[PDB]
């Protein structure tokens, strides 16, 4: 129960880290919908 | 409405691209450190969650996973600075830097459409 809530809060999938800005831009970024 | 959406608008010149890139780089180190911590913290709980899902609820292993979740969460609750402040900082930096990079990428696309 409490453990269920803990795991719900802590197991959210983070996006990969943004890469540095190559010239020209190599990877297309995007806004991420972080949970709230 | 996040401030970086008001500040970092569409790029009209290469000097602006340079300034945007420099601003991105100025916070990239903090961003990567925080992001790495967030992934490392999440990993333990994702692992424990998967274990809990594949275990028999009548097994001692199940009780051990339960206990380990409680202990690790206790570690997080007592950490300094507060975990939630770090998480908020990391989300803000991620979407800010993503936005700046988006402005730079859309500019690059536009420039490539005209030469």
Residue numbers in the entry:
A (entry chain A): 14 to 49
B (entry chain B): 525 to 639
Provide the authors' own sentences about this structure as they appear in the paper.
The functions of HIV Tat and TAR in promoting elongation are completely dependent on their ability to hijack the host super elongation complex (SEC). The SEC consists of the Cyclin-dependent kinase CDK9 and Cyclin T (CycT1 or T2), together known as P-TEFb8; one of either of the intrinsically disordered (ID) scaffold proteins AFF1 or AFF4; one of either ENL or AF9; and one of either of the RNA polymerase elongation factors ELL1 or ELL2. AFF1/4 is >1,100 residues long and is the principal scaffold that holds the SEC together. In this study, we set out to visualize the last of the three known interfaces critical for AFF4 function, its binding site for ELL1/2.
Here we work with a fusion construct such that a stable obligate complex between ELL2 and AFF4 is formed. The crystal structure confirms that the AFF4-binding domain of ELL2 has an occludin fold, as predicted from the sequence homology. It shows that the IDR consisting of AFF4 residues 301–351 (hereafter referred to as AFF4ELLBow for ELL1/2 binding) folds up into a helix and elbow joint arrangement that makes extensive contacts with the occludin domain of ELL2 (hereafter ELL2Occ). AFF4ELLBow is ordered over residues 314–349 and buries 1,535 Å2 of solvent-accessible surface area. It begins with helix α1 (315–324), is followed by an extended hydrophobic sequence (325–327), a polyproline segment (328–330), an extended region that doubles back on itself in what we refer to as the ELLBow joint (331–343), and a second extended hydrophobic sequence (344–349). Hydrophobic side chains of AFF4ELLBow α1, including Val316, Ile319, Leu320 and Met323, are buried in a hydrophobic groove formed by the C-terminal half of ELL2Occ α1 and α2. AFF4ELLBow is centred on Trp327, which forms extensive hydrophobic interactions with the side chains of ELL2 residues His559, Met562, Cys614 and Glu615. In the AFF4ELLBow joint, the side chain of Leu331 sticks into a pocket comprising Tyr552, Tyr555, His618, Leu621 and Ala622 of the N-terminal half of ELL2Occ α1 and α3. Moving closer to the centre of the AFF4ELLBow, L331D and I334D reduce affinity by ∼20- and 8-fold, respectively. This highlights the role of hydrophobic residues in AFF4ELLBow helix α1 and immediately C terminal to it in the central cluster, as the critical anchor points and affinity determinants. We observed a cavity at the AFF4–ELL2 interface that appears likely to be present also in the AFF1–ELL2 complex relevant to proviral activation, on the basis of the complete identity of the AFF1 and AFF4 residues involved.
